Structure 1
Amino acid sequence: KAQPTEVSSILEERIKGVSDEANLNETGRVLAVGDGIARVFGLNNIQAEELVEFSSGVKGMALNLEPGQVGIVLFGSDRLVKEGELVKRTGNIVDVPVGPGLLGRVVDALGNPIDGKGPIDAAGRSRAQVKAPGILPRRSVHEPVQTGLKAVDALVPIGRGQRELIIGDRQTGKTAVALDTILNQKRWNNGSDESKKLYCVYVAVGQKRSTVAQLVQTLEQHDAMKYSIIVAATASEAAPLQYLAPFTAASIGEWFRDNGKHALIVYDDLSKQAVAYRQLSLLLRRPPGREAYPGDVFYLHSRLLERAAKLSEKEGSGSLTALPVIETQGGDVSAYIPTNVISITDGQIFLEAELFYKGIRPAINVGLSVSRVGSAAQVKALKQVAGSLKLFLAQYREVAAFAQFGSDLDASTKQTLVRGERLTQLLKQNQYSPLATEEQVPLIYAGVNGHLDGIELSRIGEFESSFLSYLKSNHNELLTEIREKGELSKELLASLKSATESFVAT
């Protein structure tokens, strides 16, 4: 590649200029290194939390500016590094190559591209730890959005800046819940609507690189990589990389949302990020805290999540809605990281172990799941008309709560049980099948109006598909309006009732 030769010439010209203006005579020499942390002397005037460029090639952050020995973790493998190699002060706080161009590119810790697509343009390289907007530059969740999979989403919405959280066991596919959530950035984002745009940016904090390939392929095939920047941090990658990755995602979220367009984020498994912070603290010198994990686990978690918000029109009414994903062991809701985060995030969707093998590909514990904004910022289809359907969702969840071993006191309880159980067998939006703001209310409305409830529970698995297709090719005007008019009016309710009669008939 002659272009590779030109790139080599340009880079070596930059290197020759750097060497000519080295301005590095008293810069530090790495005294010792280990566990991705390097104890380095010198560097007498290094600004705190500024990347340090190391001779072995791998760089790293400088965390603890201790008296004399300034501690810089190594953001790369140690087999290259060695004691005494020169440490070059980058002179800048850790900043991430950020901007709209990164679209479809998988970037390393600070933003080094890793797919092999070459450079990606930048609209700003800001520090990895930005101060979040306060009170006045913040605002309410006045603009709703769609989670894509019905996924108990009309039940508990995910609105502008709704800092929702999740949980699950190993291989719980909560990652897949995230992926489906992202895929909904194709029914609005793939159009041309900024107001409908929610430019998602997933993360990859500590996952097997094979899983990374699976994510990339699933993004391309369903045509998601057009709208999702997936920052990557391999399990084979070094601990400082994984630790800094969530900060990089924060930077990308700032670069997007701060511009004034409504954007979204979904941090990957953040439990690995916590384990990385544990490595960074307990390995460098910092005494451990509660749950044997580093003391500032909450501090790091907040500084990640608290970056997300929904600013006001003063700041452009944009937002960076976030869906941080935490992992437990044994689906443990009661844990230091899990409970502490559930205090930080404004929404929770609990994924169990039984249901993960018991009855639902989604297996989202509807009763356990909750979001701190159900009314404000919910699908206007799911509330403005189906607000009674949301209260019915809560009521039927409470109903199924008591459905374990109680007798048959009456027929009312039994009818509620059968209808709600058909509804639950219905509501699981199949994997990678995001199709929502068209007949969301329909399930509960038909159950209370007795359209689907009269069908067999098992048969609903195809009856729903038939009803949807009938609404599509037969109730096309009414279904398209429910998509677009923004509400299911009493007249549209009557037309949908007619379409429901048609679906019941054929």
Structure 2
Amino acid sequence: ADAKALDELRKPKFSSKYLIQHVSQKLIPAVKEWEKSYQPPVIHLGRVLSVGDGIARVYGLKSVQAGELVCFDSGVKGMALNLQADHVGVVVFGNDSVIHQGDLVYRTGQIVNVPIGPGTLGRVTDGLGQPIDGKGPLTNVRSSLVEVKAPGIIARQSVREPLFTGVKAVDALVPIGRGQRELIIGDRQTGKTAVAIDAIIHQKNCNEQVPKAQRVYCVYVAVGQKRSTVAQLVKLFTQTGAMRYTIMVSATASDAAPLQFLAPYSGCAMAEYFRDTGKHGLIIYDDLSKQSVAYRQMSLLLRRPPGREAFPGDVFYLHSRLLERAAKLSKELGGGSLTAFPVIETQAGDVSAYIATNVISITDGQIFLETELFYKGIRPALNVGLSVSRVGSAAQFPGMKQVAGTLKLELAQYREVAAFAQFGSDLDAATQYVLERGARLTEMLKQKQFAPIPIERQTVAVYAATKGFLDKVRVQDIVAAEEAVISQVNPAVFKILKANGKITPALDAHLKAELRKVKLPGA
């Protein structure tokens, strides 16, 4: 039955036409009596063959591009994943209960788009860019592809500028540069969102103090979250004024798994508007561990072979091609940047899980948030021994770099001395200096929620702690000693430290002088 024997059936070999001529005069009368039972034929449109599991099989669509938006006649979007010889498998961006077998699939003629621009700033959109805040359509905006390739080696430069989080433990010990991706990884309920929200609130405080080219425009992508959590978060950004600079992309827990899978690419494309036009972006992918679970659902429903923890083989490429778009661009490309904060939830502190170790291999540092430090009230529960930022170090505040070298070191000894003897075997006077200074600096670094600190008030507060000026207070009123420090010093000393960037020797002993005339609550 080879094709050598089948392509002989191209040329006619009947030599007897007594049935060709007969039915050629009865076929068109036969088809004409069955026309209200024919659906109209389909070549460049599509018709749905099978729908189920959130994947439609579409007959027709002769000229769909691979991976483009198709539109069902229900109004639902899809994306032509695999073009096959006979059908097209599309993944439905929405509920598949409204797609039937026999429905028309229309072609939009464009690979998957989101509206990007200045007019997407302020808005709450879904995983596809359609706004859900109810205040109209997006205007002053244009469409861009959600699967752009990341800039290459020659389109980048080194990470030089600091992105100030406003979180005290972060901007001192794990400092974030401005084109750098940084993983926020921890267990459930450990302050992972609170570090990312405090970064977004803090950029609002700094955009009214920087000359328009150093303004950070944040983007928050919420994948798999509760819709009440997203609505409580939009209200917090609206009441702090942070929605003027924030895009809120939301694919919640009830949304379709292709919408949750697409939402971090949709939000990265909206934030890449600011990277590509010389501005600076801040993208937060809250639970990128929930986006891999949504993509695992689509890959198993497409009957692709599962690997470790039943994740597909390309779940690394899911996240790596996403986080590679967070770059600092070179000066011929505008000098813009995009810094990412993926969030990974961890089960029982196990950092050696599959998706956790994938994103550690992609991102530049981590912010580990320990459950045990979070239960002790040390919030943000930053695991100092494990949290890294090597691209953002030597890109941080020069004043903070002076005082945090001693802070990281006195915490490095504090973990090492507490490793030896926490129970009272014998206490040296030299090591009880370390436990007295270590518990001083730990209470120093813990700060409360939704009030990020400027970097000049943050340098002074650690200057007052790595040096003397706080050894009088035991451990308890150090939180109250900080506003005793930062309100009682002359507020000009924050202006010189901000404008120079570092602690000059003129300001050094001026600030020793102001820290001796502050009145400390532990007396």
Give me the TM-score of the superposition, normalised by structure 1.
0.90
Equivalent position to 1:27, from 22, 41, 45:
45
Task: Decide whether aligned partners of structure 1 residues 278 and 107 sit closer, same or farther in structure 2, where only a CA change above 3 A counts.
Answer: same
> 1:13-412 to 2 correspondence within 5 Å?
25-384=43-402, 386-402=404-420, 404-405=422-423, 407-408=425-426, 410-412=428-430
Change (3 A) 1:401 1:124: farther
1:385 Cα shift? 6.0
Secondary structure in 2 matching 1:431? coil
> Aligned partner of 1:73: which letter?
V
Can you give the 5+ residue segments of structure 2 that lack an aligned partner in the other structure? 1-40
Instruction: Return the letter of the residue paired with 2:503.
Output: L
Post-superposition offset of 1:25: 4.8
Distance 1:385 1:488, change over 3 A: farther
CA distance in 1, matches of 2:358, 2:422: 31
Equivalent in the alignment of 1:429: 447
Aligned CA distance change for structure 1 residues 325 and 401 (closer, same or farther; 3 Å): farther
Give distance in 1, aligned partners of 2:46 and 2:473: 75
Are residues 484 and 403 of structure 1, via their aligned partners in 2, closer, same or farther at CA, if it must alter by over 3 Å?
A: farther
Rate the CA distance shift 1:103–1:398 in 2: closer, same or farther, 3 A: farther
Change (3 A) 1:24 1:112: farther
Q: Does the 8 A contact of 1:346 with 1:371 survive in 2?
A: yes
* CA distance in structure 2 between the partners assigned to 1:147 and 1:395 by the alignment: 26
| Unpaired runs of at least 5, structure 1 | 1-22
Q: Is the 8 A contact 1:141 1:377 kept in 2?
A: yes
CA deviations over 1:459-482 (Å, ceiling 9, x no partner): 1121111111112xxx11112222
Q: Is the 8 A contact 1:389 1:441 kept in 2?
A: no
1:59–1:74 CA contact under 8 A, matched in 2: yes
Query: How far does residue 141 in structure 1 lie from its aligned partner after superposition?
Result: 0.6
Amino acid at match of 2:157: R
1:123 Cα deviation after fit: 4.1
CA apart distance, 1:400 = 4.6
Q: Is 1:460 aligned with 2:453?
A: no
Alignment partners' CA distance in 1, 2:427 and 2:441: 22
Cα distance, 1:178 vs structure 2: 0.8
After the TM superposition, which of the residue ranges 395-404 and 449-458 deviates more from structure 2?
A: 395-404
| Aligned-pair Cα RMSD in Å | 2.0
Q: Which structure shows the bigger proportion of residues in strand conformation?
A: 2
**2:515 pairs with 1:500:** yes
Which residue identity is paired with 1:373?
A: V
- The answer (yes or no) to whether the contact 2:155–2:329 under 8 Å persists in 1 is yes
The alpha carbon displacement at 1:220 in A equals 1.0
- Counting matched residue pairs gives 481
Which sits farther off after the overlay, 350-359 or 210-219?
Answer: 350-359
Q: State the identity as a percent.
A: 64
**Per the alignment, do residues 398 and 328 of structure 1 end up closer, same or farther by CA in structure 2, a change over 3 Å counting?**
same
Tell which deviates more after alignment, 379-388 or 34-43.
379-388
Whether the 8 Å CA contact 1:139–1:311 is kept in 2: the answer is: yes
C-alpha separation between the residues in 1 aligned to 2:294 and 2:395?
Answer: 34
Q: Secondary structure at the match of 2:70?
A: strand
Matches of 2:520 and 2:186, distance apart in 1: 41
Q: Which amino acid counterpart does residue 194 of structure 2 have in structure 1?
A: A
Q: Distance in 2 between matches of 1:505 and 1:39?
A: 72
2:81 is paired with a residue whose SS is: strand
CA distance in 2, matches of 1:358, 1:133: 43
1:450 aligns with 2:465: no
Superposition deviation, residue 196 in structure 1: 3.0
What does the per-residue CA deviation read over 1:414-466, in whole Å, with 9 as the maximum and x for residues that have no partner?
A: 21121111110121121001113123233443334321122121011211111
> Structure 1 pair 80/258, CA: closer, same or farther in 2 (3 Å)?
same
Distance 1:448 1:26, change over 3 A: closer
Structure 1 residues 196 and 454: alpha-carbon distance in aligned structure 2, compared to 1, 3 A threshold: farther
Alignment-mate amino acid for residue 254 of structure 1 = E
Distance 1:325 1:441, change over 3 A: same
TM superposition shift of 1:395 = 4.6
> TM-score normalized by structure 2?
0.87
AA aligned to 1:29 is R
Distance 1:316 1:348 in 2: 28
Q: Which amino acid aligns with 2:324?
A: E
CA contact (8 A) 2:186 2:346 kept: yes
SS at match of 1:152: helix
